[PDB]
Amino acid sequence: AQNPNCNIMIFHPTKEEFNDFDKYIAYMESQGAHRAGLAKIIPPKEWKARETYDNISEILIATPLQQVASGRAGVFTQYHKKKKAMTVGEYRHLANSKKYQTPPHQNFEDLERKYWKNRIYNSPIYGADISGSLFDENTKQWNLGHLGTIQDLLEKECGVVIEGVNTPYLYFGMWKTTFAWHTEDMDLYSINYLHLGEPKTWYVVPPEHGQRLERLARELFPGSSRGCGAFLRHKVALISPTVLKENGIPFNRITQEAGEFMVTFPYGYHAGFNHGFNCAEAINFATPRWIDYGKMASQCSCGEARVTFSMDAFVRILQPERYDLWKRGQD
Ligand SMILES: O=C(O)CNC(=O)C(=O)O
Ligand SMILES: [Mg+2]
Ligand code: NI
Ligand SMILES: [Zn+2]
Secondary structure (H helix, E strand, C coil), rough: CCCCCCCCCCCCCCCCCCCHHHHHHHHHHCCHHHHCCCCCCCCCCCCCCCCCCCCCCCCCEEEEEEEEEEECCCEEEEEEEEEEEEEHHHHHHHHHHCCCCCCCCCHHHHHHHHHHHHHCCCCCCEEEEECCCCCCCCCCCCCCCCCCCCHHHHHHCCCCCCCCCCEEEEEEEHHHEEEECCCHHHEEEEEEEEEEEEEEEEECCCHHHHHHHHHHHHHHHHHHHHHHHHHHHCCEEEEEHHHHCCCCCEEEEEEEECCEEEEECCCCEEEEEEEEEEEEEEEEEECCHHHHHHHHHCCCHHHHHCCCCHHHHHHHCCCCCCCHHHHHCCC
């Protein structure tokens, strides 16, 4: 078995190897990369996502989210308070303000210490989930707005034609902006490209050990657990590396820098934080190996997790028994 300790693997494809996206994913899996839940891909030196970032300041963040925490430093939830619209230029200036900027630090490890010590005492503002793309249309390799669609994968594997579309999302981050512990909708893959700015630190649990994280989360968030049988789908709960180590949960960590891709694999729980002003682009995707994960994925039916138009069809075809109750949650 390849990668039996489930370590995060880092790949350096040549420009020749960067042509065929599906084939490279399948290569990484042949080496065991999926066992970690997360992999890093460093693009060939010749590749670029676009020529410059010089003209992005007029993108609008229609609903910036203030991430307010409750709990203790290592075990907390966050809620998202909606703020007034602002441009990317306005948000960058805010991120660089004395109130919101990255503090002085020695290295990534000192910054990680300061994040876990201090996160809960501040409420950073995240421009998340903005439909759009920063890839130039002429970038032919690993262009996240030109991938094969999940609907077309389901049709190729299973023969069934379904409605829905699959488009990318932009994330504008600042110091302390946080992504809670989650897997993807329908336990899909995700791919994330850090276009510019400061790094993003990731934590991940191997897919084969995901249920260990779920059991800890039910113990640590006991009212949330009674409210919903899949409450990590609400994307609100944080648990620190120190707390995971104290409870024997297997995990790994890695820092993504500008110009690098990350891939999350089906049922790979992940969480993390931004080091400073940055912009990432991400999208879900599928392969043949995903289909069985999609059939087994948990679902939120309490009504909190409220998800896309395109997830309807996935539930309806892969989980027809759940269909009914899950759509009661979504209406
Ligand atoms: O970058 C973020 O805030 C969150 N991204 C992801 O969870 C991902 O790409 O799967
Ligand atoms: Mg602009
Ligand atoms: Ni994710
Ligand atoms: Zn729920």
